[PDB]
Amino acid sequence: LMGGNTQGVPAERLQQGERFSIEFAPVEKELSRKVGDVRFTSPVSMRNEW
Amino acid sequence: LDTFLNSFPTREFEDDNEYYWDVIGSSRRNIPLVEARDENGVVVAANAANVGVGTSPFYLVFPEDWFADGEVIVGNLNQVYPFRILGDARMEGTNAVYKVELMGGNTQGVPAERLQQGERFSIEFAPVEKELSRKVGDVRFTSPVSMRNEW
Amino acid sequence: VGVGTSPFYLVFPEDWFADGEVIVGNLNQVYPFRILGDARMEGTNAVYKVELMGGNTQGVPAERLQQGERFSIEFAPVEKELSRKVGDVRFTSPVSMRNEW
Amino acid sequence: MVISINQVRQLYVAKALKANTAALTTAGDIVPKADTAKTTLYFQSMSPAGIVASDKINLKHVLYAKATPSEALAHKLVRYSVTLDADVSATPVAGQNYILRLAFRQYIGLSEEDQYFKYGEVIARSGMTASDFYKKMAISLAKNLENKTESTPLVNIYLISAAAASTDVPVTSATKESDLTATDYNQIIIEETEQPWVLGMMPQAFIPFTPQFLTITVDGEDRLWGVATVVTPTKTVPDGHLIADLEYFCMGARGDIYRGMGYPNIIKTTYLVDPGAVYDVLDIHYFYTGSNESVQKSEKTITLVAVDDGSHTAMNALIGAINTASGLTIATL
Amino acid sequence: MVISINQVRQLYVAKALKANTAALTTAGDIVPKADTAKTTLYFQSMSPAGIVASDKINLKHVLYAKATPSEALAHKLVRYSVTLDADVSATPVAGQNYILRLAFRQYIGLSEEDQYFKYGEVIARSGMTASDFYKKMAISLAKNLENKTESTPLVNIYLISAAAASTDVPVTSATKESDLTATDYNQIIIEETEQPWVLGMMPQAFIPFTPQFLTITVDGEDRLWGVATVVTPTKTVPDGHLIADLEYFCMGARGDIYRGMGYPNIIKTTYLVDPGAVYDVLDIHYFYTGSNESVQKSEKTITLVAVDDGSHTAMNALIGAINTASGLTIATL
Amino acid sequence: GSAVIHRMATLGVCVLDPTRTMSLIPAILQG
Amino acid sequence: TTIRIQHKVAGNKLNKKLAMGIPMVRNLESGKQVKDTANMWMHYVDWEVE
Amino acid sequence: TTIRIQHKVAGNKLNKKLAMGIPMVRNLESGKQVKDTANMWMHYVDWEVE
Amino acid sequence: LQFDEYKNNAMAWGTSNRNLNGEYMNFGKSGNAIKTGAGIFEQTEVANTMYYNTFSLKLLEDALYELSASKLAMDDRLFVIKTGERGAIQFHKEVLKTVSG
Amino acid sequence: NFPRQMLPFSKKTKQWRKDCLLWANQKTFFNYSLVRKSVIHKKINY
Amino acid sequence: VLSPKDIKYIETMPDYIGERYGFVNQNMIGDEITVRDGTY
Amino acid sequence: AGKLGKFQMLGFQHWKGLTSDNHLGAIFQQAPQKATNLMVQLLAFYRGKS
Amino acid sequence: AGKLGKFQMLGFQHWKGLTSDNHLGAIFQQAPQKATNLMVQLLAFYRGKS
């Protein structure tokens, strides 16, 4: 937990169905190591007949 | 191995994908026989008597539907025992059973050794009578294959 | 011994083979031996962890792994993705003759 | 489907155990092989076209090896209890339009912005109780959300009688008003449903939803009508489709990278996992480092799948074949 | 495997025989439905995507109906027994070269003008007997034929011990004459193999052969040294690669004619015939005649397959269900 | 670093119809 | 002596195009398949009946 | 705030042409997927890293 | 030079390690499968390959004729045997055995 | 990948000229020139 | 040669700022970079 | 009958007489035509880049 | 995440980070190239015109 939080996250906010999104990747200023990754996609198709 | 390898030419490709090409074969087929049956359904054995005596009809079981109605086909001995096919192929699963009868004026029939498994059968023609006849024969098609290679 | 493309070992009295080279025995090209890792030197000998390469799902015969069978380096294959260093390079040295006046 | 890898992943189906390289007779067997010096572990699996070994794991370079049951790979289908807010009105008021909006959030895309909004509505009348309301709304949603014209199954909706309170009476678009015969209805449960699945082309995914209520005038002030609490799930989608889509992916590391591209010319790789069976999964994640200045590690992992018969018999016998042979403590599940 | 048709042909796999329309639940189910007036026959079947019906056979317009068992569709692999000729010499004469020429007739093509030849050669010694000749001949045959770098297995080689006279002693390229220890060999059996197969793309075809001999000078006269006769077949090719080929064709009369062609943009037909099981095939053939002037017939057929284990228990139940509903007299296999 | 010269290359030889190549190999070079 | 032949084709094969996944062959008189680039299906029916 | 990102690719993807069975798309910054006609793979990676 | 010999032994004396199910049998250092294709001498040895113990013109002539009786026209029946050095003297002393008879 | 410059002038279109500039922006900051030094080496001297 | 659309790119710029443009390093042996004042 | 290499996908196929659409579809001479100008972009109000 | 038409057999697919060749084949972007100049005729002495 970032933000200086000391008392923890309430257990009713860690349930099934809780949605998690990507904010950013903060690193230390001296001697940081590599974080983050890169996300891809691909489409679909449809059909018809006579 | 440079004198051996450079005796062969080279070929340039776009990328490191596996590559394929067209392979063309040939067309002239003859169908091997699986079994031969008399007119009651009993399979002809190797030591059986003559089959189709007196131009009596008998059956001829092939693994494919290749010959048609009214066509004359011949065994390993071509033109000596010609068989005339009396109708379309009756399917037995994948097998094709033609009720055939002889077409050479032969009164004594075909021997039982010339009706066994592994005998090649080609097509000759499809004759009719000169008046009032109906349609006989049919036509056949083929296809090619392909081959790949790796890096 | 290579019954299921299983590792085994080949002890040679000189360190002449490399990290990922495919070597062959007295019968070339039928029994291709890919070296797994460097050689562990047992004094002057060297043992190479070795598996079979060319599709061998039966393994080499035990007669083809006896003492005296000469082995030859073929090449050093890798895969297309994320490959690492294999192979090495060998050299030779000259000896001198002499005459006087 | 397509998954992420820590620089490789390769899967071996463990359909049967033989413990020796001479008994590998039918397709899909496994033998975890290791020598007496506990330094090398590999799996000789009998493929449909010969004996194929694994990558030789160096046992001083394993990282984690944990085996997962099949009840932890089942996506639980969530439920939503749609009721009348009794603080608003205990009985339905005889004039207002009682409309419920379902907010679907991933309808044909992947993003929360590909939405879908489906509805059901009751005009409540005089003397209409709550059980006659829930009887009249579950049909008004089943004509919308469980109809035979719809492209995809959206939700599975149900009704609960207060005397039973545990079993559901399912309502479909063909269910008439005389089929639901109970004077003690008390809630309407809307449950997620299993979307379609194609091996490799269409992965297993789910369309989420939230029942939201429209405002009615009670007294003179427009109030909300309902309340929707998340009931604990009862129906779970099995593990058959997540492992078939995992094997179909991981056969392409040891095999053809294209799967069927160009169809006169494909290599039919035979797949061994059944999509109608539940599977246990064990992952041995390791790496490679040479005895040189090249000390950077190349992470690898091996997935072993085996059929579950309810008591995890094939996987715990597979783990015991790995622990005694290799000297790792893979925890029996 | 493309087949020929009179007109259209439809295949339905019979995995389990039920008795009611409402009991058709598992993929592969079938119920032969008819009237009580016995004027129409059709087959309600359960597809993997719902219950389907067949075409409505008018029972006055049936032509023939016969059911083919599984052992009638088993290809009998032909064998050739190579012996030394008794009239030339029963004992191999010393210093003469005994070269055998195997003459194949259909090497990669569909026709005999594409031929292929594999040889085997033995020079005899002064103390070589007949049994020691067949030891060195069949090792020299298997060294040429059954190498591991070959494209397809063409023929299998088997010796016969004279004392046993019923058990084939197989020789491979790895077989040594140290392992062939019997002192009484009388013939070398050359037997053709099962060619590879993938459904729809490669049919089940065979490459026939004939072992031919060259001449030797026994007493100054050029005689060919052996005789090669065709013994009875001992092994059978199972029915599974033919019916899974047969369903692949007749699943295009019902569904998609485009199988796989624009590969991600396809309809994928799921087949319910396992290629690892033999089948009993029933082909009921019938037609349709129009009302007034359309008296030309539309000769079609309906194919039904059913797996047996030993005795035909599943197809004889299906013939019994077609008979007790439609009222035909199909013969029970 | 160690001073390692790495080199890498891809290749492949296609024989289209191997029915047009005939070989007689001595029996001591097989099996 | 007199002979006869017949071959029936479907109705929709009037201008049936072939999409050529594998290249369409045409059996010559010599018994050799040759590659043909003609796209219609009736170019291969009219050769075979001849 | 100090942030960081990283992508790792295999070495064989230098000139890796895409035989597009389905059309290859780029994610827009707006959330949309836009169909692209480029055939080299590293054109699509380097879009998503930025 | 000794990477030229790597590409000369991989082009000519190389082998394939794939199944009939398309699976590879050998995996490299980074988990990926070491993909190899057959060289010259493992592709040309799938057909028309005979293993003899003693060379004779009874065998070579009757194997080159039956290859040329079904496949080659009568004008186009020229076969250039490629062999080694001592295979030329084994062909010299065997035609001389045929000619002296 | 730099686009092919072995083209007729009709195939040097609006998107081809734009693809040459998106290459120079994205890829090259290479500074691998045989006879001239590196930008951090000259900047120290300045 | 600048379209009226391209003028609105110049004309929609936030404000001003004003030799640390930005740094690239090729052939990096390692991942460990140290910066908080503005040089790496 | 047989194979030219270890990797040969197809076998030579043949039929007689009446050719139907599955006779032409199973010999890989029938493929669906890609509608090029027909293209469905999914309707959404995209609140990326805002 | 479901279907929009009946024959939407393709589903939207996604992954993270390192992409191999296998990720490029599961999304149907890799196909075997056809060496079009390579064409073989199986060698025989055809006697159909004989």
Précis, in short:
This is part of a larger assembly, with nine copies of chain A, two copies of chain D (333 residues) and two copies of chain J. Chain A is low in regular secondary structure and 50 residues long. Helix content of chain A is 0%, strand content 8%.
What does this structure look like?
The structure is cut from a larger assembly and holds nine copies of chain A, two copies of chain D (333 residues) and two copies of chain J. Chain A has 50 residues and is largely without helices or strands. Chain A has no helices and one strand. Chain A is flat and about 65 Å long. The two termini of chain D are 27 Å apart. Chain D is mainly beta. Chain D has helices at residues 130-145, 240-250, 313-326; strands at 10-13, 16-17, 29-34, 40-47, 50-52, 57-58, 62-68, 76-77, 79-84, 97-104, 116-123, 155-161, 169-170, 185-192, 209-213, 216-218, 221-223, 226-229, 235-236, 279-286, 300-307. In chain D, the strands form six sheets. In chain D, strands 2, 3, 4, 5 and 6 form a five-stranded mixed sheet that branches. Chain D has a five-stranded antiparallel sheet with strand order 13-12-14-9-18, covered by helices on one side. A four-stranded mixed sheet of chain D has the order 1-21-20-7, sandwiched between helices. In chain D, 12% of the residues lie in helices and 32% in strands. With 46 residues, chain J is mostly helical. Chain J has helices at residues 14-26, 39-45. The chains are: A little secondary structure (50), D mainly beta (333), J mainly alpha (46). The interface between E and L is medium-sized, with 39 and 30 residues. Strand 1 (39-42) of chain A pairs antiparallel with strand 1 of chain M. Chain I: It comes from Bacteroides phage crAss001. Chain I: This is Major capsid protein. Chain I: It is found in: Virion.
Element string of chain D (H = helix, E = strand): EEEEEEEEEEEHEEEEEEEEHEEH
- Number of continuous helical runs of chain A: 0
Task: Tally the helices of chain D.
Answer: 3
Distance between the ends of chain A: 59 Å
What spatial form of chain A do the alpha-carbon principal axes imply?
flat
The greatest interface here is:
E-L, 39 and 30 residues
Distance between the termini of chain D: 27 Å
What portion of residues of chain D is helical? 10-25%
Radius of gyration of chain D: 27 Å
Fraction of helical residues of chain A: under 10%
Q: How can the largest sheet of chain A be summarized?
A: none
Number of strands of chain D: 21
Subcellular location (chains L, M): Virion
Subunit structure (chains L, M): Interacts with the auxiliary capsid protein (via FD region). Interacts with the head fiber dimeric protein. Interacts with the head fiber trimeric protein. Interacts with the portal vertex auxiliary protein.
Organism (chains L, M): Bacteroides phage crAss001 (Bacteroides phage PhiCrAss001)
Protein name (chains L, M): Major capsid protein
